[PDB]
Amino acid sequence: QQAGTNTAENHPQLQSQQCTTSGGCKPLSTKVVLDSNWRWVHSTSGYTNCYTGNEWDTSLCPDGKTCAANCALDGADYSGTYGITSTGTALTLKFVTGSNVGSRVYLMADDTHYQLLKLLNQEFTFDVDMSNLPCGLNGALYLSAMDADGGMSKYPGNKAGAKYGTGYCDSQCPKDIKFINGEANVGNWTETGSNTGTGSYGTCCSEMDIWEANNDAAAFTPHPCTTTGQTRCSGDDCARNTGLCDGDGCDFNSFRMGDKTFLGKGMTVDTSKPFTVVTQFLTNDNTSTGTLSEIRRIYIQNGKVIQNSVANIPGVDPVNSITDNFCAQQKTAFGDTNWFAQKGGLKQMGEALGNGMVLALSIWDDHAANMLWLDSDYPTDKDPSAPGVARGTCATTSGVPSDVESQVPNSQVVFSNIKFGDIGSTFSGTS
Numbered sequence: 001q002q003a004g005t006n007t008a009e010n011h012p013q014l015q016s017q018q019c020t021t022s023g024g025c026k027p028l029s030t031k032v033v034l035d036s037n038w039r040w041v042h043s044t045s046g047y048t049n050c051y052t053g054n055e056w057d058t059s060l061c062p063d064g065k066t067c068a069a070n071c072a073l074d075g076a077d078y079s080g081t082y083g084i085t086s087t088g089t090a091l092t093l094k095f096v097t098g099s100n101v102g103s104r105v106y107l108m109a110d111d112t113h114y115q116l117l118k119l120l121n122q123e124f125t126f127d128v129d130m131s132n133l134p135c136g137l138n139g140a141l142y143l144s145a146m147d148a149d150g151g152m153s154k155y156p157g158n159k160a161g162a163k164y165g166t167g168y169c170d171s172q173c174p175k176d177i178k179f180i181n182g183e184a185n186v187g188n189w190t191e192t193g194s195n196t197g198t199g200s201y202g203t204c205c206s207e208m209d210i211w212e213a214n215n216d217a218a219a220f221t222p223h224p225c226t227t228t229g230q231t232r233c234s235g236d237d238c239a240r241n242t243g244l245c246d247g248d249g250c251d252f253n254s255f256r257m258g259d260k261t262f263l264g265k266g267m268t269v270d271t272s273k274p275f276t277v278v279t280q281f282l283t284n285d286n287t288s289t290g291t292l293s294e295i296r297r298i299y300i301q302n303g304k305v306i307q308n309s310v311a312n313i314p315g316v317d318p319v320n321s322i323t324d325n326f327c328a329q330q331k332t333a334f335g336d337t338n339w340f341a342q343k344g345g346l347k348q349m350g351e352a353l354g355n356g357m358v359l360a361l362s363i364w365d366d367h368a369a370n371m372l373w374l375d376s377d378y379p380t381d382k383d384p385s386a387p388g389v390a391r392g393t394c395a396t397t398s399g400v401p402s403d404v405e406s407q408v409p410n411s412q413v414v415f416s417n418i419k420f421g422d423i424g425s426t427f428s429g430t431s
């Protein structure tokens with residue numbers, strides 16, 4: 001895609017902190033940038049749309065390469081169009097803004113580079129307010145193995161780069177991404193919604209879901225892929241689980257793991273109020289070259305340090321962190337194939353983490369499964385009483401996009417106090 005000039009692109013500021021054991025925490029002047037899929041796409045020589053609603057202009061975009069040459073991504077009115085605002089340290093992502101639904105942004109080191117986080121033997125910490133984020137919604141904070149420049153160096157067809165949020169990929173190998181590898185994904189374009197469609201290509205990469213949640217339920221989930229970095233896929237390579245990527249991931253959702261009173265409104269982690277979420281990525285030898293061996297989670301709310309809930313499933317060790325063993329036990333017990341292990345487990349996830357990954361923050365609803373996998377029973381044809389079926393208390397009728405968009409359009413998530421660095425250094429304790 002080309003870079004458009006009709007609308008100035010000003011990235012909202014979102015300060016983060018980098019922390020070390022000896023030096024404590026220091027501010028970084030990071031910013032956020034809207035993902036390219038949400039942007040206006042128009043002719044380089046004017047104002048004519050290359051994409052309107054859910055279809056491409058066949059004149060400007062008769063094929064992927066011609067499209068990318070003819071078409072520019074342009075600047076965004078963050079608040080006005082997409083309901084994205086920042087105080088400078090707190091990011092608010094609103095659900096529905098006019099005809100726009102949801103958003104995704106990436107943390108930037110500067111105006112043309114994503115911040116590249118390397119979190120092996122490190123921790124990531126943030127605050128979240130989900131008080132206005134109900135059933136059916138997902139306020140997500142996660143890592144994707146994108147390139148810092150959004151693919152600009154890799155793909156001659158992409159002259160827009162990170163400044164315009166290009167180069168997305170994740171473990172779902174999404175085919176609804178409009179620009180991939182510097183070409184518009186116009187092949188066999190198929191409408192899937194009023195403003196969405198899919199093309200013949202997907203874009204795959206390893207993904208660490210630090211946070212996927214609403215005020216009813218939350219999950220953290222590593223997703224390894226056999227690839228290395230952002231990879232365009234075709235055919236069965238795009239297929240979830242059987243292809244390049246572990247789309248299911250190895251998830252830890254406290255409720256799914258058999259503790260139904262740990263997280264939610266008025267629970268130990270009280271989702272009706274803001275709280276702090278710490279995620280630590282431990283290696284076997286406590287070095288940044290070691291193998292990722294454990295993902296720990298600690299919560300802080302009202303000054304109280306809250307350890308992660310314990311798994312309570314027959315045939316699963318009662319642990320409270322993600323490990324390769326936990327993952328094998330959980331998959332066996334829930335009846336899910338361990339695609340996680342097949343794609344290389346924590347070691348592969350950690351290799352991705354070590355290579356550096358981009359922070360994404362997003363609010364979305366779910367046209368495929370109504371977010372039932374997050375906060376309800378899933379699959380909808382399995383016995384709810386079976387280990388792993390029940391993930392939340394939301395009704396199985398919840399999360400229909402047309403429903404939530406009508407019913408709770410002003411839902412929002414607020415992500416704040418972003419910090420990362422040495423294990424045990426982004427928060428402190430005392431008696």
Ligand SMILES: OC[C@@H]1[C@@H](O[C@@H]2O[C@H](CO)[C@@H](O)[C@H](O)[C@H]2O)[C@H](O)[C@@H](O)c2nccn21
Pocket residue numbers: 172209212221247248249251336373374378379
């Ligand atoms: O909830 C755990 C997974 C779930 O993956 C989840 O899908 C979501 C939608 O793509 C992703 O955002 C999550 O990161 C992923 O872990 C599968 O979509 C579901 O079919 C299933 N069945 C059993 C497990 N799971």
Ligand SMILES: *[C@@H]1O[C@H](CO)[C@@H](O)[C@H](O)[C@H]1NC(C)=O
Pocket residue numbers: 284285286
């Ligand atoms: C690594 O650190 C953990 C603390 O989280 C400690 O229990 C363990 O003994 C350490 N391992 C080595 C080899 O230093």
